[PDB]
C-alpha cells in the first residue's frame, strides 16, 4: 500500500504524529526543568514516552510508505520510496530523533528527561501538519490565529521552564528575582511553580513587565535578552493579527476602493443623479449577492481544461435548449459555450432597441426580461431564465427582410444576468465546422420561412 | 409604506439602530447584573422594565419589521407579502431571532438575547453604505469592541473578587468606590497590558492574571492591527499616487529631462490628482460592467456627440462605440491642442476648460474661444491618412479636459457598421 | 487684483506664516489656561504674542479673500467672485469665530482666564493644510510623516498634561497620591516642575505605559480609564501609521522580491539549467543595484500623449535625427516614431542579433557599446557606441533587397546595453499618417542599397 | 586589478569593513560613557582602534579600486575611479572618519574616547553591506530579523550609555532615578554598571517602564523624550515585522483570494459538487507542488532576450526532436518555442477525443499520456515526456483524409505538464519564413503519403 500525501489518510496520520511531537516539545523541557513534575508522574511519563517513540517508528514507516509525484504520477515502487526517504535529511533527523538516549536514565538517573530532547528533531513533521491544515481548513484565519497562539504559548512555556531552571541554578529564594524558596509549602506546589513560571514568562515575553526586578548581573542579562525576545514576540503577534485583518478585509477594501473611485468619477464628470443612484445600487447589489467579481478575471486563474469543463457544466444544457443549436455536434457546442460572454443589466436597462444592429444572441441566466412597445409602459412578453433572443440575427441568412436589425425592444425588468454569443464568435467557431455552418444556415432559413 | 426596502429606508435603519441598542443593552448589562450586585430587589423594577422593553423590540422586529422586508429573487425586487414572509422564515436570521427570543430572575438566563447579533451586522453594513469615509466609524466600531471586552473583563474581575471575597487579598477588588470603575480600571491596566496593579498571590489569582494578560496582548494586537488596516486603506490612493509620481520623477531624473518638462509633468500629476482623484479613468472603466460603462459614457458625452452635425443620421450603436472609445486628456495652460500644419487625426470634445483658436498676422490673436461642450476637429476623422492638416493654431487657455476620439478608433468602429461607414464616406465626398 | 496662486510658493510660505500662530494658540492657550503661573508671570509676553497671532489671523482672512481657485482650468481673479467663494465656505465662518474679540472678557473675568482665546483654535485647518502641502513638497515624505505624527502626539500629550494639571487643581493639589503634589512645596511649586511633571504623567498615560501613582477617587479612576483609552487610540494610531509607512517604503522591494521568487520557482519548476538560472539572478541583481527595476511603459502609462511625447523627444529625438533615413522626416513623424521606441536591455555577451535572424526592428543605442562580431564572436569588426543605430534598412522592407529583412551582421552586447527598438510594424503604423514621408523613407533605403549594391 | 562591486570579493570586503564600523558604533560610545571600560582595557582599545583605522584606510583604497558601470562597462582606469570616488560625498565622509583625533588624547586625556566618534561616519559602508546581504542571502526574513534586532540592540546600548552619562553628569546616587553610587561594592562594578544601564534602556525603549521615577526636571524631560523615542522604536519594530509577515504570506493571501473568488463563482453558478471538488483538489495540487504562479505572468517580468533564453533552455531540444521541425532553421525554432503555450492536465483528464478539432500541437513536457479506445479502459500506448502528437494537424495540408480531426483519444494518466503550439501561432511564425513553410508543408505531405493517408 502507498499513502497519497494529498489524501485524507496522510493528514490524519499528520495529526496522529503531531500529537507526540507537541507532547515532546512541551513536556520534555517541562519535566527537565521542573524536577517535581518528572518525579511525581514518572510512570505516566514512561508510558507516554514509549507510546511517542512507537508513533515515531510508525511515522518512519509511513514515510517509507508515502508516495511522491514523478511524471505527474504517484510513485508506488517500494525501493524508490525507501531511497527517496533515506536520501532526504528528514531520514537523518528521524534517526537522530529515535536514538535510544533513554539508556542514560540508568546512568544519570530518573531526573534527567533532557536526554529525550532529540525527539524534538521531529519538529518539521509538526510544522508540515499545520501547513497542510492551512490548506485544508475552511476557516484559514481562525486556524492561523490558533497556530500563532499555540506557538506563542509553546515559546512562553519554554521560557517559563528556562526561568525556573535559572532560578534553580542561582538558588530558589536566594534573591527577589528568582522563583522563591520551594521549601515553602505555598511556593513548593508543582502547580504553583509551573503557573508562576508561566506567568513570569508571559509577562516578560510580551513587554508587560510586572515582575520583580533582577538583582544579579546574569539576571539582568537574561531579563534584557528575554525582553528583547518579548519585543520580537509581541511585534510578531501584532504583525500576524494585522496581516490577518488586512487579508479578511482585502476584498471589502478593494470593493470600497472601487466604490470610492466610481463615486469620485461621477462627481467629477457631473453624471446625472439618477445614473449615480443606479450605479451605486448596482454595486451594492453586486456585493450583497456576491457578484461584484468579474467572471473573466476570476476564471482566468483556472487552466483551460477546468475552465472549459466549468463553462460546459454551467452553459451546455441552456445552449442545447436553443432551437438553432438543438441538433449540433458536441464540439461546436463546447466552443460556443467557451465563446459566451457574461453581461449584467440593472432594472430598466435596455438590452436592445428597435432598429439596433443585432450581432449577439442573449441567453438569460438569472433574470427577467420584457419585450416592450417603444414606450416602456407595456410588455408584450416576459422572457424568464433559460430563454433567448437574437438566435436568427447571429446567422447570416440571405433573403431576410428583418435581418441584421432588432425587431423588438428588450428591457431588463430587474437585475438580469445574461450571456451573449457574438456573431463573430459564432463565425469563428463555424470556420472549423463547415457542415454545421450549412446546417445552421438552412435551419435559420427554415425558421425565417415560418 | 406597505413594503419597506431594507437597503435604502431611513426609518428602517433607525429601527435597526433601536434593535442594536436593545442588543447592546443585553450584551452590556447581562454580565453587569450577573457579576455586580447592582441587581438589587429594591431596583429590580427598572431592570425588569428595560428587559421587557428590549424583548418587546425583539418581538416587533421578528414579527412586524422583518416580515415586511423586500428581498431579491432572480434579480427582482419581491414585495409580495407571502413571499416576503416565506423569505424571512426560511432565512437563518429568523432562526437567530427565535433563539434570542426564548426566555430560558437570573441575568445569565437572558444570555440567548445576545444572539441577535445579525441585526448589528446589518446596521453596520447600512452605516458603511450610507456615509462616505466610513473607516472613521470603523475605528469607533473597533473601539466599541475594545470597550466591550474591557467591560466583560471588568465584570469577570469582579466575579473573581466575589469568588475570593472582597479585600481578602491585595489582588482582588477591595470593596471601596463605585466597584465598576475600579474593575474597569483593572480591565484597562490588564487588557491593555499596562500593568501596575497589585501582584496576584494565590494560584487562582495568578491564573486569572495570566489569562487576562494573554487576552490583553491579543486584544491590543487586534486594536493595533485594525488601526493599521484603517490607516493603510485610508492612505492607499495617496500612496499609489505618490509612488507613481515618484517613479515618473525618477525616470526623468535618470534621463536628464530638463526642469521645464519635469515641472509640466509634476503639474499634470498634481492637477489630475486634485481634480479627478485618479490618474486614469479607463482603469476604473474596464472594471465596471459593460452596460454600466456604456451608460456612464452616454450620460457624459452622448448629447454633445449627437449634437455634432458630422454624425447626424448615423447608427446609434456606432455613436455609443465612439463614446466608449473617447479618452480623457488634460492639457496644461498654453498647451497646443492643434499645431498649425500638423496631422489632424483626432476629434476633440471639450469636457472642461477653454480652447482658443489662434490666427491673424504674426499669431498670438484669439479668433474664437470654445467653452466646455464644444467639438472641433471632427472633419479630420474622415480622412484617408495624411489628407488632413490643421489649418489654425489651437491652444489651451487653462487646464482643459478634452475627450479625444482619434481616427484609428473611429475606423475600427466603422468597419463594424457598414451603413454609418457609407454615410460618413458620402458626407466626406459631399463636403468637398 | 493681485491673486495668490494656491499651487505657488507664496501660498505655501503664507501657510507656514499662519501655521505658526495656529500652533502657538493650540499649545500655549491651554498651557496658560491650565497653568495659572504661566499666564500670570509672562502676561506682557502673552499679550504681545496674542496680538501678533490675531494680526496674522486678519492677514490670513485677507489672503483667503485674495486666494484664487481653479474654475474651468483658470485661476479666478475677480475680487467679488473670490470673496463670495470664501464667504460661501465654512472656513469663513470658522475664521470669523476664531477672531471673535473675546479678549474683552478679560475685563469680565480677570487675567486668570485665557480660555476665552480657545476660539482661535478654530484656525486649525490652516495648520493642517500647510502640513499636507509640505507632504506634497518635501523630498522626504516618510521623514516628514514621522515628524508630523510625532508633533501631533506631542501636542496631544501636552493637552493631556494640561488636563491632568487642571483636574489636580480641581480636586486639590496634594489632597491624595494621584493628583499633582502640593504647590506650596519648593520643588513641586515651580512652574517648570509643574508642566514637566504633568507632561511626564501625560506621556506615561497616553503611551499606555503606566508607572504613575494609581487613582484614589472615582473621578480620578474615570479620568485614568478614559485617558488610557485615548492613549490606546493614540498608540494604535502611531504604530499603524509607522507600519503603513514602513510597508510603503518596502513595497517596491516586496514586489521585486516576489517577482524574483516567482521566477526562481518557475526555473525550479521547468528544470532550467543552473547557468541560465545564474544569468537570471545576476540580471535581477543588476536591476536592483542600478535602480533599473522600473518599467518605462508602466512608469509613463498614466501620462498624456503630449507629456509622454515631450519626455520621449528629450530622450530620443537627437539620436533619431542622427539616423540617415529619418534625417529629413517631418517633426510629427519623428514624435510618433520616438513614442513608438521600446526599451530593451542586454546583458554583457548577449547577442542582439546574429547573421540569419529575421530583422523586424531597428535598434538605437541609448547607453552602452555593441560589437559587430564574426561567426565565432571572438573578433570584432567595429564597436558601436551610444547614439549609434543598426537595422534601419530592415524596417523599411525595401523590395529587391538581397538581405530580405535578415541580419547580415552579428551584434553582441559587450557590456550592459540599453537600446531602443523601433519595430517595422510600429514604423508603418506611424507612417500611416505620412504617406509622402513613407515614400521618401523607401526611396532613401533604396538609394542606400544601390550605393551598397544590394539592390538588383 | 579593479574590484567588481557586484562580485563576491566586494561583499567579503563589505563584511571585513563592517566589523570595525560596528565595533566603533558600539564601543566608542561605550568607552566614552563608561570611563572604567575605557581605562581598564586601554591597551586593547588602542590596538582595536588602530586596527579599525587601518581597515578604514584599506576601505578608502578599495573605494579607489571599486569600478563603476559607465556605458554598461566597468571602468578600470585608476584616475577615473579615484576622481569618481573623490567627487562623491563618501570621500568627504571617509576623510572626516579618519581625522587623526587620537592626537587629542594628549590634550583631553585618555578618559575622552568621544574623539573617535567621527569614525561612526563610516556608517554608509556598514548599511550598504546589510543591503547587499539583503540581496545575497537565501533567507531574507531571517537576515532582516537579525538586522532589526542588531539595530535595536545598538539603539538600546546607546540609550544605556546616555542614561549612564546623564547619571554621571547629575551625580551617581544623588537621587533615586540616576544610576546609584559607584562606590558601592555591587553597583561600582563595570559589568553591573553596563547591565543595569542596558536593563534601564530596555525597560524605557520598549514601552515597559518599571524604572525608578525621575526626581529632577531634566530627568523628567529625558524620560518623556526617551519613552517617546521608545514608542517610535516599538512602532518601527512592529512595522518591520508586520511588513515581513505580510510579505511572507502575500503569495498565500493572493492564492487564497483566487481560490475564494473561484468558490464564490461556483456557488453563484451552481456548479456541480464534483466539479467544485475537482477545482479545489487542483488548487491544492498547485499549492502543494509549488505550481501556483502562471508561466505567462512570471515570464512577463523577464526581458524579451532573457525570456527567449529561458524558453530556449526549456523547450529547444524537445522541439527539435519533432520530426517536422527537425530540419528547420534556428530562428523559426526559437519563434515556435516562444509560441509554446503551457497546459496542465489532471489525472483522468482528456487532452482530445476522437472527432475533436486538432488545431494545436501538444508536446509532453512531463507526465504520461495514454492513447485509449472508446471505452477508455484499454490503453494502446503510453507517451512519456518529450513525446508529441498532432504535429500533422497544425499543418494545413491539402488532400488530407483526416482534416482537423483527432483520430485517437488522448487521456492524462497523471498530472501532465505539456505545451501546445497552435496552428495560428505556427502560421504567424512562418509568415517570416516562407521557405520553411514550404518545407514544412512538403514534409507533412510526404509523411501523409508514407503513413498511407492523403
* CATH number of the domain that residue A324 is part of: 2.60.120.10
C394 annotated to bind ligand = yes
A416 annotated to bind ligand = no
Contact A362, A345 (CB under 8 A): no
CA angle B216, B218, B220 (to 5 degrees): 65
The nearest CA of chain B is from the CA of D245 a distance in Å of 13
Q: Which of residues 141-200 of B touch C (CB under 8 A)?
A: 143, 146-147, 177-178, 181-182, 184-185, 188-189, 192, 194-196
Question: Does C397 contact chain B (CB < 8 Å)?
Answer: no
Structure-block grid coordinates of residue B198: 497589585
Structure-block grid coordinates of residue A75: 510513485
Which residue of chain C has the CA closest to A210? C211
Question: Does B85 contact chain C (CB < 8 Å)?
Answer: no
Chain D hits for B224, Cβ within 8 Å: 238
Question: Does a structural domain hold residue B257?
Answer: yes
Tally of structural domains, chain B: 3
Chain C hits for A242, Cβ within 8 Å: 243
Chain C hits for D133, Cβ within 8 Å: none
Distances (CA, A) of B278 to A74, A258, A263, A265, B288: 51, 11, 11, 8, 15
Q: Which of residues 395-434 of A touch D (CB under 8 A)?
A: 432
* Rounded distance between C-alpha atoms, residue A110 and residue A153, angstroms: 27
Contact: C73, B386; criterion CB under 8 Å: no
Contact A113, A45 (CB under 8 A): yes
Contact A228, A247 (CB under 8 A): no
* Rounded distance between C-alpha atoms, residue B91 and residue B85, angstroms: 10
Question: Does D212 contact chain A (CB < 8 Å)?
Answer: no
CA angle C404, C406, C410 (to 5 degrees): 150
Do B273 and B388 share a domain, yes or no?
Answer: no
* Rounded distance between C-alpha atoms, residue C195 and residue C39, angstroms: 13
* Structural domain that includes position B32: 1-130
Question: Does a structural domain hold residue B136?
Answer: no
Q: For testing the chain B interface, which of A157, A184, A201, A237 should be mutated: the one with the most B CBs within 10 Å?
A: A237
Please, what's the b/e burial string for B23-45 (b: 16 or more CB within 10 A of its CB; e: otherwise)? bebbbebbbbbbbbeebeeeeee
Structure-block grid coordinates of residue B187: 480591565
SS3 track for chain B: CCCECCCCCHHHHHHHHHHHHHHHHHHHHHHHHHHCCCCCCCCHHHHHHHHHHHHHHHHHHHHHHHHHECEEECCEEECCHHHHHHHHHHCHHHHHHHHHHCCCCCHHHHHHHHHCCHHHHHHHHHHHHHCCCCHHHHHHHHHHHHHHHHHHHHHHHHHHHHHHCCCCCCCCCCCCCCCCHHHHHHHHHHHCCCCCCCCCCCHHHHHHHHHHHHHHHHHHHHHHHHHHHHHHHHCHHHHHHHHHHHHHHHHHHHCCCCHHHHHHHHHHHHHHHHHHCCCCHHHHHHHCCHHHHHHHHHHHHHHHHHHCHHHCCCCHHHHHHHHHHCEEEEECCCCEEECCCCECCEEEEEEECCEEEEECCCCCEEEEEECCCCEECHHHHCCCCCCCECCCCEEECCCEEEEEEEHHHHHHHHCCCHHHHHHHHHHHHHHC
Contact: A238, B225; criterion CB under 8 Å: yes
* DSSP classification of residue A184: S
- C376 burial level (CB within 10 Å; 0-12, 13-18, 19+): exposed
The nearest CA of chain C is from the CA of A242 a distance in Å of 9
Q: Which chains pack against A, by 3+ Cβ pairs within 8 A?
A: B, C, D
Q: Which of D240, D265, D415 sits opposite A299 (nearest CB)?
A: D265
Distances (CA, A) of A398 to A183, A408, A449, B421: 107, 21, 11, 22
* Rounded distance between C-alpha atoms, residue A319 and residue A363, angstroms: 8
Q: For chains C and D, count residue pairs whose Cβ atoms are closer than 8 Å.
A: 172
Q: For testing the chain A interface, which of D245, D342, D417 should be mutated: the one with the most A CBs within 10 Å?
A: D245
Measure the N-to-C terminal CA separation of chain C; round to a whole number of Å.
74
Question: Does B274 contact chain A (CB < 8 Å)?
Answer: no
> What is the SS3 assignment for C149?
helix
* Rounded distance between C-alpha atoms, residue D58 and residue D19, angstroms: 13
Strand order in the sheet with B400-406: B327-331, B400-406, B346-352, B375-376
Question: Does a structural domain hold residue B196?
Answer: no
All residues at 6 or more sequence positions from B223 whose CB lies less than 8 Å from its CB, including other chains = B142, B143, B146, C232, C236
Q: For chains B and D, count residue pairs whose Cβ atoms are closer than 8 Å.
A: 5
Question: Does D287 contact chain A (CB < 8 Å)?
Answer: yes
Structure-block grid coordinates of residue D104: 587629542
Chain A hits for D270, Cβ within 8 Å: 314
Q: Which of residues 237-256 of A touch C (CB under 8 A)?
A: 238-239, 242
Q: C178, A222, A234: which is closest to B196 by C-alpha?
A: C178
Please, what's the b/e burial string for D191-216 (b: 16 or more CB within 10 A of its CB; e: otherwise)? ebbbbbbbbbbbbbbbbbbbbebbeb
**Residue A1: strand pairing partners:** none
* Rounded distance between C-alpha atoms, residue D261 and residue C197, angstroms: 56
Where is D416: in which H helix or E strand?
strand D416-422
Structure-block grid coordinates of residue B279: 490618474
Do B268 and B385 share a domain, yes or no?
Answer: no
Chain B hits for A202, Cβ within 8 Å: 210, 213-214
All residues at 6 or more sequence positions from B229 whose CB lies less than 8 Å from its CB, including other chains = A242, A245, A246, A249, A253, C240
Name the phi and psi angles at B351, rounded to 5: -75, -35
Question: Does B275 contact chain A (CB < 8 Å)?
Answer: yes
* Rounded distance between C-alpha atoms, residue C367 and residue C354, angstroms: 20
Question: Does C332 contact chain B (CB < 8 Å)?
Answer: yes
Contact: A232, D207; criterion CB under 8 Å: no
Question: Does C387 contact chain B (CB < 8 Å)?
Answer: no
Question: Does C262 contact chain D (CB < 8 Å)?
Answer: yes
Q: Which of residues 198-257 of B touch C (CB under 8 A)?
A: 220, 223-232, 235, 239, 242-244, 247-248, 250-252, 254-255, 257
All residues at 6 or more sequence positions from C376 whose CB lies less than 8 Å from its CB, including other chains = none
Structure-block grid coordinates of residue D271: 456548479
Contact: B243, C75; criterion CB under 8 Å: no
Contact B329, C304 (CB under 8 A): yes
Question: Does D306 contact chain A (CB < 8 Å)?
Answer: no
Domain finish residue from B279, B304, B335: B279
Domain finish residue from B86, B114, B130: B130
Q: Which of C240, C314, C432 sits opposite B261 (nearest CB)?
A: C314
Do B271 and B293 share a domain, yes or no?
Answer: no
C198 annotated to bind ligand = no
Contact: A249, B232; criterion CB under 8 Å: no
Question: Does D250 contact chain B (CB < 8 Å)?
Answer: no
Do B26 and B41 share a domain, yes or no?
Answer: yes
Q: Considering all CA atoms of chain C, what is the largest pairwise distance in Å, rounded to the nearest integer?
A: 112
Question: Does D403 contact chain B (CB < 8 Å)?
Answer: no
Structure-block grid coordinates of residue B85: 414572509
Do B270 and B381 share a domain, yes or no?
Answer: no
Do B269 and B295 share a domain, yes or no?
Answer: no
Contact: C243, D235; criterion CB under 8 Å: yes
* Rounded distance between C-alpha atoms, residue B251 and residue A127, angstroms: 45
**Beta-carbon count within 10 A of C132 CB:** 13
Question: Does C225 contact chain B (CB < 8 Å)?
Answer: yes
Domain finish residue from B101, B130, B159: B130
All residues at 6 or more sequence positions from C426 whose CB lies less than 8 Å from its CB, including other chains = C337, C340, C342
Q: Which of C246, C271, C368 sits opposite D239 (nearest CB)?
A: C246
Contact: C344, D314; criterion CB under 8 Å: no
- Report the structure determination method: cryo-EM
Question: Does a structural domain hold residue B186?
Answer: no
Question: Does a structural domain hold residue B338?
Answer: yes
Do B254 and B290 share a domain, yes or no?
Answer: no
The nearest CA of chain D is from the CA of A395 a distance in Å of 22
Tally the C-alpha atoms within 13 A of residue B342's C-alpha that lie toward its C-beta.
16
Chain D hits for A290, Cβ within 8 Å: 264, 267-268
Q: For testing the chain C interface, which of B241, B242, B247, B353 should be mutated: the one with the most C CBs within 10 Å?
A: B247
Residue with cell 488586512: A246
Structure-block grid coordinates of residue D409: 483519444
Which residue of chain D has the CA closest to A312? D271
Q: What is the CA radius of gyration of chain B?
A: 34
Question: Does a structural domain hold residue B75?
Answer: yes
Q: Considering all CA atoms of chain B, what is the largest pairwise distance in Å, rounded to the nearest integer?
A: 106
All residues at 6 or more sequence positions from B83 whose CB lies less than 8 Å from its CB, including other chains = B71, B73
CA angle D54, D59, D61 (to 5 degrees): 95
> What is the SS3 assignment for A186?
coil
Measure the N-to-C terminal CA separation of chain A; round to a whole number of Å.
66
Q: A374, A365, A409, A417: which is closest to A390 by C-alpha?
A: A409
* DSSP classification of residue D154: H
Which residue of chain B has the CA closest to D239? B228
Distances (CA, A) of D282 to B365, C106, C365, D265, D277: 70, 79, 47, 16, 8
* DSSP classification of residue D447: H
Structure-block grid coordinates of residue D450: 508514407
Do B290 and B316 share a domain, yes or no?
Answer: yes
All residues at 6 or more sequence positions from B417 whose CB lies less than 8 Å from its CB, including other chains = A357, B314, B315, B317, B318
Do B290 and B423 share a domain, yes or no?
Answer: yes
The nearest CA of chain D is from the CA of A238 a distance in Å of 7
* Rounded distance between C-alpha atoms, residue B310 and residue B323, angstroms: 15
Contact: C218, B223; criterion CB under 8 Å: no
The helices-and-strands tally (H runs, E runs) of chain A is: 17, 10
Name the phi and psi angles at C416, rounded to 5: -70, 125
Structure-block grid coordinates of residue A370: 420584457
Residue with cell 513641586: C188
* Rounded distance between C-alpha atoms, residue C332 and residue D239, angstroms: 50
Q: A245, A253, A244: which is closest to A287 by C-alpha?
A: A253
Q: Which of residues 87-146 of D touch A (CB under 8 A)?
A: 145
* Structural domain that includes position A312: 296-449
Q: Which chains pack against C, by 3+ Cβ pairs within 8 A?
A: A, B, D
* Rounded distance between C-alpha atoms, residue D412 and residue D282, angstroms: 14
Amino acid at each position: 500500500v502507498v499513502i497519497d500525501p494529498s489524501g485524507n489518510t496522510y493528514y490524519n496520520w499528520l495529526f496522529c504524529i503531531t500529537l507526540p511531537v507537541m507532547y515532546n516539545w512541551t513536556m520534555v523541557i517541562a519535566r527537565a526543568c521542573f524536577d517535581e513534575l518528572q518525579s511525581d508522574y514518572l510512570e505516566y511519563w514512561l508510558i507516554l514516552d514509549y507510546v511517542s517513540d512507537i508513533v515515531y517508528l510508525i511515522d518512519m514507516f509511513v514515510r517509507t510508505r508515502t508516495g511522491y509525484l514523478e511524471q505527474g504520477l504517484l510513485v508506488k515502487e517500494e525501493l524508490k520510496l525507501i531511497n527517496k526517504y533515506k536520501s532526504n535529511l528528514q531520514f537523518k533527523l528521524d534517526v537522530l530523533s529515535l536514538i535510544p538516549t533513554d539508556l542514560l536514565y540508568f546512568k544519570l538517573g530518573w531526573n534527567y528527561p533532557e536526554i529525550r530532547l532529540n525527539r524534538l528533531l521531529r519538529f518539521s513533521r509538526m510544522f508540515e501538519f499545520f501547513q497542510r491544515t492551512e490548506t485544508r481548513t475552511n476557516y484559514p484565519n481562525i486556524f492561523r490565529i490558533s497556530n500563532l497562539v499555540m506557538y506563542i504559548v509553546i515559546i512562553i512555556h519554554w521560557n517559563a521552564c528556562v526561568f525556573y531552571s535559572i532560578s534553580k541554578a542561582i538558588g530558589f529564594g536566594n534573591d527577589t528575582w528568582v522563583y522563591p524558596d520551594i521549601n515553602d509549602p505555598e511556593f513548593g506546589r508543582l502547580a504553583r511553580k509551573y503557573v508562576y513560571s508561566l506567568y513570569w514568562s508571559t509577562l516578560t515575553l510580551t513587554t508587560i513587565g510586572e515582575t520583580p526586578p533582577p538583582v544579579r548581573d546574569s539576571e539582568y542579562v537574561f531579563v534584557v535578552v528575554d525582553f528583547l525576545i518579548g519585543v520580537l514576540i509581541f511585534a510578531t503577534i501584532v504583525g500576524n493579527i494585522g496581516s490577518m485583518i488586512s487579508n479578511m478585509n482585502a476584498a471589502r477594501a478593494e470593493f470600497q476602493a472601487r466604490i470610492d473611485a466610481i463615486k469620485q468619477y461621477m462627481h467629477f464628470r457631473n453624471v446625472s443623479k439618477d445614473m449615480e443612484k443606479r450605479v451605486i445600487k448596482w454595486f451594492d447589489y453586486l456585493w450583497t449577492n456576491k457578484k461584484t467579481v468579474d467572471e473573466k478575471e476570476v476564471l482566468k486563474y483556472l487552466p483551460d481544461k477546468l475552465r472549459a469543463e466549468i463553462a460546459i457544466n454551467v452553459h451546455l444544457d441552456t445552449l442545447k435548449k436553443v432551437r438553432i443549436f438543438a441538433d449540433c455536434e458536441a464540439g461546436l457546442l463546447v466552443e460556443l459555450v467557451l465563446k459566451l460572454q457574461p453581461q449584467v443589466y440593472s432594472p430598466g436597462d435596455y438590452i436592445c432597441k428597435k432598429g439596433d444592429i443585432g450581432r449577439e444572441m442573449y441567453i438569460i441566466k438569472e433574470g427577467k426580461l420584457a419585450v416592450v412597445a417603444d414606450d416602456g409602459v407595456t410588455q408584450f412578453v416576459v422572457l424568464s431564465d433559460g430563454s433567448y433572443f437574437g438566435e436568427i440575427s447571429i446567422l447570416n441568412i440571405k433573403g431576410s427582410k428583418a435581418g441584421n436589425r432588432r425587431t423588438a425592444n428588450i428591457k431588463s425588468i430587474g437585475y438580469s444576468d445574461l450571456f451573449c454569443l457574438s456573431k463573430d464568435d459564432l463565425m469563428e467557431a463555424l470556420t472549423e465546422y463547415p457542415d454545421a455552418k450549412t446546417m445552421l444556415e438552412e435551419k435559420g432559413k427554415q425558421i425565417l420561412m415560418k | 409604506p406597505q413594503s419597506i426596502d431594507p437597503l435604502t429606508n431611513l426609518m428602517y435603519v433607525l429601527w435597526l439602530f433601536f434593535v442594536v441598542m436593545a442588543w447592546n443593552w443585553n450584551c452590556w448589562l447581562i454580565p453587569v447584573r450577573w457579576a455586580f450586585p447592582y441587581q438589587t430587589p429594591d431596583n429590580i423594577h427598572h431592570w425588569l422594565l428595560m428587559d421587557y422593553l428590549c424583548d418587546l423590540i425583539y418581538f416587533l422586529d421578528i414579527t412586524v419589521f422583518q416580515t415586511r422586508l423586500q428581498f431579491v429573487r432572480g434579480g427582482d425586487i419581491i414585495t409580495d407579502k407571502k413571499d416576503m414572509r416565506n423569505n424571512y422564515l426560511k432565512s437563518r436570521r429568523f432562526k437567530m431571532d427565535l433563539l434570542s427570543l426564548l426566555p430560558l430572575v437570573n441575568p445569565l438566563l437572558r444570555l440567548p438575547r445576545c444572539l441577535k447579533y445579525m441585526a448589528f451586522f446589518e446596521f453596520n453594513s447600512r452605516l458603511e453604505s450610507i456615509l462616505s469615509k466610513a473607516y472613521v466609524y470603523r475605528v469607533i466600531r473597533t473601539t466599541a469592541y475594545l470597550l466591550y471586552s474591557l467591560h466583560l473583563n471588568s465584570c469577570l474581575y469582579y466575579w473573581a473578587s466575589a469568588y475570593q471575597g472582597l479585600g481578602s487579598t491585595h489582588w482582588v477588588y477591595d470593596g471601596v468606590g463605585n466597584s465598576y470603575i475600579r474593575c474597569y480600571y483593572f480591565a484597562v491596566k490588564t487588557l491593555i497590558t499596562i500593568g501596575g496593579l497589585p501582584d496576584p498571590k494565590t494560584l487562582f489569582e495568578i491564573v486569572f492574571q495570566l489569562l487576562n494578560y494573554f487576552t490583553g496582548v491579543f486584544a491590543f494586537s487586534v486594536m493595533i492591527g485594525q488601526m493599521r488596516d484603517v490607516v493603510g486603506a485610508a492612505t492607499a490612493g495617496q500612496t499609489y499616487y505618490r509612488s507613481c509620481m515618484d517613479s515618473t520623477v525618477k525616470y526623468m531624473n535618470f534621463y536628464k529631462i530638463p526642469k521645464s518638462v519635469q515641472n509640466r509633468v509634476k503639474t499634470w500629476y498634481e492637477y489630475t490628482w486634485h481634480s479627478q482623484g485618479m490618474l486614469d479613468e479607463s482603469e476604473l472603466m474596464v472594471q465596471l460592467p459593460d452596460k454600466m460603462r456604456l451608460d456612464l459614457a452616454i450620460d457624459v458625452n452622448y448629447n454633445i456627440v449627437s449634437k455634432v452635425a458630422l454624425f447626424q443620421g448615423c447608427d446609434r450603436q456606432m455613436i455609443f462605440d465612439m463614446l466608449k472609445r473617447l479618452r480623457s486628456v488634460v492639457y496644461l495652460p498654453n498647451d497646443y491642442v492643434c499645431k498649425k500644419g500638423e496631422i489632424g487625426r483626432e476629434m476633440y470634445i471639450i469636457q472642461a476648460g477653454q480652447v482658443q483658436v489662434l490666427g491673424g498676422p504674426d499669431g498670438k490673436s484669439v479668433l474664437v474661444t470654445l467653452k466646455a461642450g464644444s467639438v472641433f476637429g471632427e472633419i479630420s476623422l474622415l480622412a484617408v491618412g495624411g489628407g488632413n492638416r490643421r489649418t489654425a493654431n489651437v491652444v489651451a487657455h487653462g487646464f482643459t479636459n478634452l475627450f479625444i476620439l482619434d481616427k484609428k478608433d473611429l475606423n475600427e468602429i466603422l468597419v463594424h457598421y457598414p451603413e454609418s461607414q457609407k454615410l460618413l464616406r458620402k458626407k466626406a465626398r459631399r463636403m468637398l
